[PDB]
Amino acid sequence: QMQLVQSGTEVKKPGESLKISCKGSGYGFITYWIGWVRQMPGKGLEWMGIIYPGDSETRYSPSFQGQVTISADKSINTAYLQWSSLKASDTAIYYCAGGSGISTPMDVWGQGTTVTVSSASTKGPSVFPLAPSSKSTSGGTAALGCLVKDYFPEPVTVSWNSGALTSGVHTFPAVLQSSGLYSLSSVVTVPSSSLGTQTYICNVNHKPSNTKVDKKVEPKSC
Amino acid sequence: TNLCPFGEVFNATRFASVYAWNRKRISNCVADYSVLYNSASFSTFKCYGVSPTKLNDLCFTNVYADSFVIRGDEVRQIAPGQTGKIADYNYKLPDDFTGCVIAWNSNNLDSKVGGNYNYLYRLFRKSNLKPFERDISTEIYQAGSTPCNGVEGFNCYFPLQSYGFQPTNGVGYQPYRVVVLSFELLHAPATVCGP
Amino acid sequence: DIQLTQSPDSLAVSLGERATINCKSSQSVLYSSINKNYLAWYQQKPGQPPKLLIYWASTRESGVPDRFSGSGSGTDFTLTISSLQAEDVAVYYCQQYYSTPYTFGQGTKVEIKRTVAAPSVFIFPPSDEQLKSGTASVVCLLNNFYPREAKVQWKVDNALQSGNSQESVTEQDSKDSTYSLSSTLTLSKADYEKHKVYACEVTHQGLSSPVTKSFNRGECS
Ligand SMILES: *[C@@H]1O[C@H](CO)[C@@H](O)[C@H](O)[C@H]1NC(C)=O
């Protein structure tokens, strides 16, 4: 049994070229045909094309003919998918799948290559405290959290109390604001009695911008 | 319950010509097919109908192993829907092909120093071959309007050509040994499975 | 070339119950030689790559648990999960490999069905830190509800807001099979300081009447 491994995450501007790769490790590779699948954010799977490494037989889908270029390199067991001029609408995740024949199901899949095309530039996030309400059910539970706003690109990692607090935590999917920057919110529900006895801190890490921020969330003085 | 004779076909001492391609009918055997994936000796390994990796868990009625020798430029033509001298006149494959195509270079074997002309191929024929057809007709091809009464000459050509297999030819003009596996299954008893 | 259409788009079944997904083809996919239809069923979980479950429309990949089964012929195919488990919440696709170009189905989202659960509604005002920047984000949280359908309506001094709110929803919590929604209302600091009452009105099946959570600008809330 063999496996596939694709290149790393890509973040490009509109108009730049790009060429992502997909290398297969293991014995029995001579038989595998390698295809490319595109998955747009929240959308379904789209079959782009297929190639054979041994003789570089390349078959495109009608939707991607002349839009992309599929190539291969049998000396290193690596298939390639490239764009000449990237468009903002090309932002998606591209999997490479492998079938041991041409009319054969895709048995082996890669991990996926996330490609983001946007005119936005790299910017670190701003973390704002979603402070818990003072007027809350004192016998029940209260809610607080952090607002990770105006960052680019994806992703950001959000933990609570340096990983100590995990139960009852909901880190929401980011939204793409009209300004081209992302916005995300993480919340946690805790017993209201613990609002004055336990210190709550959210940890935000944005590796693309190399920005780490710890924000202490506490009930407003008022 | 016996071992499969697949080793005879691939490791055969001599290989047949294109037009007179050999065909080994295999039955009552058990083959693992793993020796075919793992061997890096094959320069081309194109299965079409079935995933070869998940084959030793299946069973078929009859598996046919065709074998011959072609030129490097011709290796692409052993495939469904292909068009060319080899695909139309020597060996044609059906569009619904359920099998596999294996090819490996053999310039070190099928090449005399001055040229091994013993490998032939049909370059002349007035109708394209039907799938899995085998033609040995030596009848003189009639290219012109005047009939050829068994005598060749102008517009009267011998229908077979010789491969000039010198070891100094480019990779395009070098002898490649080709095996073609075909798997068929009717509602008859299947007699060739794997482990 | 060949077209594939799935049904339904979304499907919710309780734990241990049966899940049925249909896939109809615009062309017969049956390799005449061996009598095996070239239809495949894939499973894709959030963040995961797709995973092959069934090939030839009835034969199952190794390791696939005994609860997945494929059936059908001609242009009608079915995927059936006998005892639906929590780890099976995913999107399922059907794909043909008769002839290039390959084509996938539209996809079926499969979630767990549970009892109706009302949401815990909270509302957060913008921090003074954010007000120093120039904008203001008012956040409304709908925690641990089911089903996923929910309507959030923003009100600024009892005036309905539309076109300035973005919301996102978490994946189904594997523990309680509930969703959580976060809606953000964005407006300039100038527009923010002009009004007093900011409210979030939630309409959900588990709520007999709409639930409103509000606050007054400046007051301790
Ligand atoms: C053919 O001979 C080689 C060399 O010994 C051996 O490795 C292989 O198993 C034999 N059979 C086949 C089918 O290649």
Numbering used by the authors:
A (entry chain H): 1 to 52, 52A, 53 to 82, 82A, 82B, 82C, 83 to 100, 100A, ...
B (entry chain C): 333 to 527
C (entry chain L): 1 to 27, 27A, 27B, 27C, 27D, 27E, 27F, 28 to 215
Paper text:
CR3022 uses both heavy and light chains as well as all six complementarity-determining region (CDR) loops for interaction with the RBD. The buried surface area on the epitope is 917 Å2, and SARS-CoV-2 recognition by CR3022 is largely driven by hydrophobic interactions. Out of 28 residues in the epitope (defined as residues buried by CR3022), 24 (86%) are conserved between SARS-CoV-2 and SARS-CoV. This high sequence conservation explains the cross-reactivity of CR3022. The most drastic difference is an additional N-glycosylation site at N370 on SARS-CoV (N357 in SARS-CoV numbering). An N-glycan at N370 would fit into a groove formed between heavy and light chains, which could increase contact and thus binding affinity to CR3022. The epitope of CR3022 does not overlap with the ACE2-binding site. Structural alignment of the CR3022–SARS-CoV-2 RBD complex with the ACE2–SARS-CoV-2 RBD complex further indicates that binding of CR3022 would not clash with ACE2 (12). The epitope of CR3022 is also only accessible when the RBD is in the up conformation. However, even when one RBD in the SARS-CoV-2 S protein is in the up conformation, the binding of CR3022 to RBD can still be sterically hindered. Structural alignment of the CR3022–SARS-CoV-2 RBD complex with the SARS-CoV-2 S protein indicates that the CR3022 variable region would clash with the RBD on the adjacent protomer if the latter adopted a down conformation.
